[PDB]
Design a protein around this ligand. Sequence first.
Ligand code: SAH
Ligand code: SAH
Ligand code: MG
Ligand code: MG
Lengths: 242, 242
Amino acid sequence: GPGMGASQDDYALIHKNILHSEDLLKYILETSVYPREHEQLKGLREVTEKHEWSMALVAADEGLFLSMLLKLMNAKRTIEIGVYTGYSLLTTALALPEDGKITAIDVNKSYFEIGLPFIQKAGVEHKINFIESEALPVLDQMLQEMKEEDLYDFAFVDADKPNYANYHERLVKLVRVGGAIVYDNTLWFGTVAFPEYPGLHPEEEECRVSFRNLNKLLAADPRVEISQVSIGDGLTICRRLY
Amino acid sequence: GPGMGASQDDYALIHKNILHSEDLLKYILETSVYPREHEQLKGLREVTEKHEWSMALVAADEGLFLSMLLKLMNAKRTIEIGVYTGYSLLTTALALPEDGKITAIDVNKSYFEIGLPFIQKAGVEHKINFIESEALPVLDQMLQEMKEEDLYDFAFVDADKPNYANYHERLVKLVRVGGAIVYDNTLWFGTVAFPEYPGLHPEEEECRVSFRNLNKLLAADPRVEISQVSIGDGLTICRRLY
Ligand SMILES: Nc1ncnc2c1ncn2[C@@H]1O[C@H](CSCC[C@H](N)C(=O)O)[C@@H](O)[C@H]1O
Ligand SMILES: Nc1ncnc2c1ncn2[C@@H]1O[C@H](CSCC[C@H](N)C(=O)O)[C@@H](O)[C@H]1O
Ligand SMILES: [Mg+2]
Ligand SMILES: [Mg+2]
């Protein structure tokens, strides 16, 4: 209702980690991430750390992993669902070749405007077509229009978590055979390991349930092969088989 | 040489995990790994779990991730350093195309022969050239024989951990530009996060120190891009830049 509105301080999970200790995560970041992080990614991360929804920001070690996957697979055309201030988007744009093209979809362009100056300074704004919309209608329109020559090599899904299974039904048609779909947050702070988890905000509980269902669906889906990876808050890589 | 025992039972870290939640690791395996694990990988894993060096067996979630990398990068020729009973090796042979080729190097052929019946039943023994040797002399001979056109697409390094930096100096010349070198165990049970860590066997302490040194070296090495990934016992993916 009216009042102060939603704050990440209403959530129960924000200080949880999947790694053994905060010391281990800090070691990875300080040793293997920050020395390899573009100046503009550092600037975008530091501003975003102060933002009211900072809990949503993709982890920086996960960012370098996404970059590595895009390069090893020679991705050129990609889609991102859930942009926020742009950390995964800028990571992706820096990883792609000069002629790479990203379709980036988010319901709230004001978040993207926080990252836009960093993206511009990095020299990669030309690779990004940002669309301000709920993602499902955009994907459904794409399914009417896109031809084989326009299929995506890679999709990163990091938007509203309860809709991931709906996004999957479109993305297995929009990403080429042999292409990759990466779903972020599939371990949901560790809560997915429990059939009940006390004290969660109703939105957090909804995502525990939706991720438990999604993880079973993806493990059973013959259209993809999968790898669930315990980096960040968990992610699942899907490769389209047919 | 004379000294103290260094069998698995002499080590302190066997049961320590990089994830804090044993329930979360089991959830990943039961939900996203075992339903996707080839029958012959299951059989090879089950025998290896009973073997006296079971702690060295690659994690099964990590196996599916290595398979995913190999397929997404369209690897065809690969090298494996440290085979043990063959779990990563069989994972790799299943992932590669029918005409794929693996050079697999281990000092102990008897360990390989434990896994070999499972590899044979999977129909992929023909992709594997197993070399019974210490790896460093094999790599040095390869430097003298290899042509640019036969460089490997992918190397998995999982042998004697203190020698990884020595292996790296050869592998950056034996993997193609754009190819991948994956170093296993680069988080060493999480002990790398600490400048001092009491209660280790001397060989475990040697690896903590050698991984702390390697992780700094790789983060500073301009010949590669890197991503350290907190899956299994940690691994670092390197992509050769020039
Ligand atoms: N239905 C929907 N369609 C598209 N975007 C949505 C959406 N519901 C929520 N979002 C957006 O999903 C984003 C989730 S956070 C994305 C994090 C970002 N990828 C990073 O690298 O840090 C938010 O910006 C939010 O506005
Ligand atoms: N100098 C050396 N050269 C090659 N192999 C070595 C070596 N020193 C030890 N090894 C081998 O390194 C292996 C480490 S365990 C390898 C695990 C395996 N990749 C898996 O997927 O489970 C052992 O089999 C050991 O015999
Ligand atoms: Mg996320
Ligand atoms: Mg290992």
